[PDB]
Design a protein around this ligand. Structure first.
Ligand SMILES: O=P(O)(O)OC[C@H]1O[C@@H](O)[C@H](O)[C@@H](O)[C@@H]1O
Lengths: 532, 527, 532
């Protein structure tokens, strides 16, 4: 009935207009909204004191957070606004001292805090009735990144605040945030070691370092060696801003707490696994900085490999941090170096709109650039769980949608259902919002062959970046890459990166705002994935 | 045209079954095996297929003045009619012994007063009554069926449609003792016209009382009607629950991979009723709970639940698999059985089993049983299967409960056992119990969540529907019935010899406390 | 890996469904079948004139076959259909005369042939285009079994056909088939001798007699003495319908033509030998006839003892018939009378189904009957080849399967393999079809202790009964029990039979359709057999 299909479509619209009309009538009566509609449909189917949530140990002692490169883009646009959100969420100790350390003088600290920091503070009414109070916890310090007497001067500014601490324990804990280019990480850590470690009477030292952590096996190991005489792996926190705690729980708990999910989490049942990181934005005039890095070092060797490890690891001995990281390392050691045959690159050109100019139209990009802005590749995990299972990492700038997800596709059951069924999927999406769902086939209510695909959903708290800083403050290093883990990761990628810098794989042009090169989607279809 | 293929993969099915049974070179065995084979008032929306409205259909309900016919079968055909699942010009004949002078009064008094008075349906009663005639006859007189034939053949030629002849559905709403006689009488006296039409026969329980008495009845009927024609109906099995069982498992890798001993800790199939048996001792006392619902009804659900993967969804493949799995079940023993018999309710409103003039004093008949079955094959060895059925207990509940092995590491007490529930009564539900994260901390912060897995014809109606459509999937086959009786007959005899005796339980309680102890001692855990 | 075992089972099914799908696709293309599937799998792993096959001597002279008791169940259901199969197979001379001799008048011979004979003719299209032609070779004759003038009348009917013979030699050969109760065998053979021997000008006389041949030593010897003044042992053929030529070749040739098999065919290497005859049917309302016989006289003293002789005999001087029978006799003389200690009896009760009513529920069975319907027993052959080797005969009605086999179990090699090996077996099965196979242990492809049990197979032609009649027509008496052989056989069994009729061993009840009494399988385990 092609006549009835057309009449059903119109009837579904008019039936949706009928529902909405009722919901309209009642909303005109009561007149309170987004909440009210919710209940009526199911039926006949802020500026309050920060409630502190910090633990007893955290309020027991002075805390100082030192943000180096405090006037830099990362610090002012990302670190400081995160600290504010933690402040508002009640996740910093009440008396916390925040020091912005920069190389550049400032005549007016107060103007610096308003005009350079508070501008990037979330303006959400629930916050921004607390901005002024947070600014009172922030101080500016001006010094060099290589000069010990500066770090002593700094140490004496910090001691002054530690010693005024109006609570039980003595000394103070110090979190050093290195929002800096890697080239000065060694001199700062040393400066810190020589001049500004916590008082002997007590307190810990932790250091967060930002990417990049090398550019290949050799440069990465060097930077590790350069840091390790000053900070061991309990103190050093290499941050990947994108790794959300919520996603990490979705990966770990759904699987390891449930027999249904742990039993199918293997080669006997999974057809392909894809980890996807997509952005609509381009390199945004930072093309020249990106041109030295590329999409592979930018997000794949660090962020996606960290998601891969958690996804593919064997069951840890406990849910303790270092047991989880032991498994990440174990699984990565089973992965072969990626081959150029198993990689498809792209470089974006102007969007249809012009709103994203082409990569090579950025004047800071040098003529002849073969820098990949898109890459899909397959990794092989050789162990009993995973041998022969395709793992595809895919990352892209200037593509069709902003999107971060894990897609596991299970093998089809050809008999008995055949075309009346379809590969099951588990999807863990982090962006553009959280969802985790399985797609299975079920009966339709009213012949056995009559089936339906149905999504079963399985699922202001801190955002990804905020949860990581908080974790650093509590001493939880689960979601930070460990020195051994880093090296192994670099060994998976370094030969491919070398073959790319040697010119043996060229990026395929693609219009900004499309899915990327056509060859990439074909590559995915040729390595285990089946559509609809 | 098509009967080549129906033969071809009819052949592949035999090769299929042979290879899985010997477990060989797969190739060399296939070759070998081939060589050696030489208030709204909803109006009626027609949901019927092309084939069903292309030929006359007649439905003859034998025993039409019996309580079964008048209170269940006619009302159910009425509900199908309203649901638009009978062809427009369907012919229904009510066949009985008693002479009826006033046939239209009969339809009012005997039949229509049992049709649902529900507001949506009320309007169609009189219109459905048009499609029904009475017929007066015996169940063995050859001339009574010649006459029936002629009454039937009139209506078949008054049908204006593409196909000649008429399909005939014979509904034996009769005591089992007359089935053979009626079936022979149909065979010689009223088969469909050779020009065209199928014949199908629906028979009602009991299907014997043991292996011997059940095999006797199959042997009496098998000269007149084969397994494609004969439908042994189980009132209680519904289309919707069978689909939840087969589809949710077999369509899906995630469920198919855990449907086995390595992942499942125990399986319970439960049939609970609040009602008792008052004034039904004539039927019930010689039958008891095991024969009444467990040997027939619960065992079909078991077989569907436990069967190996069928090659296709064709009726007889599924039914081949039911048989294969039932044949791996050991006869139930007296040690794997707890029996009950209900006494008067605590509040005294409800009489006990024995308090009934239709029940002989000192009766031993169970109104309640829990039993453990063992399926000895690769998929199921060691897994406890518990069947539970009880009359006059605390609630009306029919469900399958599958409990999966716990993952003790690494979540420990922050997890428990996954479960899958398929529920049919008092309302349909299907869901899994899993543990997910709660946001706000430690990995060990978790929650138990129930994931839901997504006027219609009822259970009985959906089986009549399937009989009309020629789909025998949900009907116990002859061989299947034999194997089921062999599971239960030695126990049933051990019971009639009083090796095992029923424990009393007040009506309205859960049943004998020993039953819940049995279940916990057979692998179930209730946290 | 209990997880992988479950995943392997499912993978083997889905892999078998994949194979079958391909075989399905190709069969939908060509569309010719049972033959086509055969080749495709290995790959990328009738009404025509009777072709006469009769020898020159057989067509040289008239043949007449006289079936006495021609309207009896044996004749009409078994003898006549066999003759038809021989006819179709081209193994009767073209001009053969078949005479049905019965005691009972018949108004219409033609109706007799259609309604009483042809009904039991195989309806296989390849045959039944020849039925009418065969009926033209059959005549009915009505006479007494004791009256000489009847046999003269018969002789003159036969001469009429012999004398019309349109080929070289004169007279005619006469095969007399006595499908009769034994009580009239003497009077018929005498009647034959006095009245209907072949013409002097030429032709042989042969007589097939049906069982029983006595019921003990004494009655059997008497019947032998009663027959021997009329027919010597070159003319008298005592038929055992079950002894197939194919099985006899399997026993004789596999062993005596091969050094590998002859070398192990002895006490040094064989642990136990079992000869099994199993039926699913009951006594089938003939319970009263069976009640006078029992399973021991019915099938064990005749049929199984004949299989035993061929199995256990020393190498014959030649493969000539009388040399083979000389050895059968030799070996049977080494066998001790069976003892009641070495026998377990059974009597079947109703099947679970009712489809086989109990033995004692047959109204022709007299109350109190102790007639065995099942028996297992051990025989001891005392000679250099066999001393100490258990030989178990087992026969059963109303058991679990229809099955006839020889099972030889060889001693285990405990060292060095131990549990990684298992007793070798040679199996010669006749029913429900022919197979001969040895079970040995071999390596598995991919440690020395890793072993597999493997069956090596070593292996419309006439059926068993047909081959025997044909043999009678050719003068081959190999597979017929000889007078001396019979007597020796009876002496092995007569004391046991006497101890049974004297009530010193009672049958154990067993449900029809089970394996038989539990004590019997234990008896087999206590006399040399080891399972799996
Ligand atoms: O209502 P549904 O889901 O169609 O099924 C009806 C159910 O009714 C119950 O009473 C039966 O015990 C079930 O076996 C049956 O499935």
């Amino acid at each position: 009935s092609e006549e009835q299909s057309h009449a059903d479509q119109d009837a579904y619209v008019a039936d949706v207009d009928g529902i909405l009309d009722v919901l309209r009538a009642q909303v005109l009566e009561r007149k309170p909204i987004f909440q009210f509609i919710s209940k009526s449909a199911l039926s006949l189917q802020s500026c309050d004191r920060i409630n502190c949530k910090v633990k007893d140990e955290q309020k027991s002692r002075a805390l100082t957070i030192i943000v180096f490169g405090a006037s830099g883009d990362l610090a002012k646009k990302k670190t400081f606004p995160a600290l504010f959100d933690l402040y508002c969420g009640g996740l910093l100790p009440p008396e916390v001292n925040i020091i912005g350390y920069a190389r550049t003088k400032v005549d007016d600290v107060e103007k610096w805090k308003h005009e350079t920091l508070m501008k990037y503070f979330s303006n959400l009414s629930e916050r921004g009735c607390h901005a002024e109070d947070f600014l009172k916890h922030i101080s500016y310090f001006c010094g060099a990144y290589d000069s010990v007497d500066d770090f002593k001067r700094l140490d004496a500014v910090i001691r002054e605040k530690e010693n005024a601490f109006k609570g039980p324990e003595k000394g103070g804990n110090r979190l050093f945030y290195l929002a800096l280019p890697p080239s000065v990480f060694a001199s700062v850590c040393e400066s810190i070691h020589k001049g500004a470690m916590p008082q002997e009477v007590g307190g810990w030292v932790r250091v967060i370092i930002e990417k990049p952590f090398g550019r290949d096996t050799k440069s990465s190991a060097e930077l590790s060696q350069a840091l390790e005489p000053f900070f061991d792996e309990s103190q050093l926190y290499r941050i990947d801003h994108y790794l959300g705690k919520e996603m990490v729980q979705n990966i770990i708990t759904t699987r390891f707490a449930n027999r249904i999910f742990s039993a199918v989490w293997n080669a006997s049942n999974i057809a392909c696994v894809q980890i996807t990181f997509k952005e609509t934005i381009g390199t945004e005039g930072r093309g020249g900085y990106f041109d030295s890095i590329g999409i592979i070092r930018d997000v794949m060797q660090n962020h996606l490999t960290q998601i891969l490890a958690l996804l593919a690891m064997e069951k840890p001995r406990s849910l303790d941090a270092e047991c989880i990281r032991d498994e990440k390392v174990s699984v990565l050691k089973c992965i072969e170096p990626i081959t150029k045959e198993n990689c498809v690159l792209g470089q974006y050109t102007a969007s249809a709109d012009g709103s994203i100019p082409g990569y090579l139209e950025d004047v800071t990009v040098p003529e002849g650039s073969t820098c990949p802005t898109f890459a899909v590749m397959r990794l092989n995990i050789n162990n009993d769980r995973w041998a022969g299972v395709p793992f595809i990492l895919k990352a892209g700038k200037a593509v069709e949608q902003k999107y971060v997800a894990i897609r596991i596709q299970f093998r089809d059951e050809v008999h008995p259902y055949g075309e009346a069924t379809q590969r099951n999927e588990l999807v863990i999406r982090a962006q553009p919002s959280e969802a985790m769902y399985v797609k299975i086939t079920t009966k339709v209510p009213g012949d056995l062959r009559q089936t339906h695909q149905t999504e079963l959903d399985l699922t202001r708290l801190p955002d990804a970046y905020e949860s990581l800083i908080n974790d650093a403050l509590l001493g939880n290093s689960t979601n930070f890459v460990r020195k051994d883990e880093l090296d192994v990761a670099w060994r998976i990628f370094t030969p491919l990166l070398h073959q790319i810098d040697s010119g043996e794989i060229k990026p395929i042009p693609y219009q900004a705002g499309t899915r990327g090169p056509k060859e990439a989607d074909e590559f995915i279809a040729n390595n285990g994935f089946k559509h609809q």
